[PDB]
Amino acid sequence: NIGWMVSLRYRNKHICGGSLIKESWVLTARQCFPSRDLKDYEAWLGIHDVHGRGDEKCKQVLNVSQLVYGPEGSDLVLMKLARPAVLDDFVSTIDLPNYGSTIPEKTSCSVYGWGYTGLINYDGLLRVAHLYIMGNEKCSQHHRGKVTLNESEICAGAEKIGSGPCEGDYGGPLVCEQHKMRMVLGVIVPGRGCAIPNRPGIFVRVAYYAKWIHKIILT
């Protein structure tokens, strides 16, 4: 199950994805915040459909009380919910990687989102793309030397076909299995074009910011 997937709503319209890492804490991206007024924002939990149609028995609508911006380099933002989310079979928390951690190249990962699909008539149901971890050397080579990669970044790309996150998928997770456990290894940030065949996705490395995350979440 995928109970950690959050849908951030701006002016009663889905703007971004997010990951529930603690009962009152959501890990998202800075690009998801046009207004500085936290009243225009809402967090939806326990949903499969973007409009929350067939999941009113699970849906957990919550308000945003605080916004904690990550270090200058990161495009991360820790979002505090006005009330803690109640964990059940439909709402759960995603584990974080430890500060000095890594996964090898070819590690099977998944990206989740209610964003742009390209399809004519998209149903609004949560989508997944199967990506595979790429090392920062091969990633810079695959990106035709246009961008040098920092320690704060994580690369993952699909096999042969053109697939990955796009508009509306930002803030969402790059889920990979670490030490027999599903963890949020990256955060979906705007890329250099949507789903280009053989072009891997650049995500913000969560393992790099794990020390700052535990500083904010542990309260």
Partner: peptide, 9 residues
Amino acid sequence: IVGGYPWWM
């Protein structure tokens, strides 16, 4: 998600 599948895949 472009070139994606429903979450349960």
